[PDB]
Amino acid sequence: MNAPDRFELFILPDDVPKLKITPDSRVPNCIIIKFEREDHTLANLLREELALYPDVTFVAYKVEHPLFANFVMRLQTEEGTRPKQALERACASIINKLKTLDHKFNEEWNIK
């Protein structure tokens, strides 16, 4: 009756970006990234793999409001080091970890 159409939790509508990055004035070298159409599934995963990279000085996230499947992530790192890269790497590291996993899950499997 008043509930949106289910498929609005992942499909982006007419000109709208998945990612929105804003600079932080509060402190030097900091940003707040607005993620569209997402949740804890992908969020918490990025947050985690950042406290592994001892080059990240800060990494938190939050859900503005539960009705809308979105979330803001605020990250702050050391001097002259762009977070995006550490995000790429650790994200790639996930894929590598997963590439390995996949493989390691295939050989393991085969022995049945």
Binding site: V27, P54, V56, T57, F58, Q76
Partner: protein, 131 residues
């Protein structure tokens, strides 16, 4: 850049007054018999039983940087380092003083009277302990 306290005490007793993971201990000084110490502590993180020889130190110095300082200074040559603030300066008769120290939720009490020019009235205060 100097020290403001150095003394080994002895656990008079350990109290776990309704705390499954924290115990409040008390102990007198080995030097003067006027300096007492009351301090709450994480019995889970740092176990301690009655009759122990601990060395307490203090002072304020060596956003909040994460670790990384492994190849930087490290005045952490100890095994317990809390941060907090001090509030009151009480005088129990004579010229004996006694400051009350709370660490963001963790209380502490010092007593004696010989820091009439050592223990300041600022917020700063870092606790240290060893062995």
């Amino acid at each position: 850049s100097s020290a403001l306290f150095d003394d080994i005490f002895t656990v008079q007793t350990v109290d776990n007054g309704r705390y499954n993971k924290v115990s409040r201990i008390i102990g007198i000084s080995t030097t003067n018999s006027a300096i007492k110490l009351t301090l709450d502590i994480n019995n889970e993180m740092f176990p301690v039983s009655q009759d122990d020889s601990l060395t307490v130190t203090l002072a304020n110095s060596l956003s909040w940087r994460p670790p990384k300082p492994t190849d930087k200074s490290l005045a952490d040559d100890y095994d317990y380092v809390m941060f907090g603030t001090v509030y009151k300066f009480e005088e129990g008769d004579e010229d004996k003083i006694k400051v009350y120290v709370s660490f963001g939720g963790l209380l502490m009490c010092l007593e004696g009277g010989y820091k009439s020019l050592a223990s300041l009235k600022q917020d700063n205060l870092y606790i240290l302990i060893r062995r």
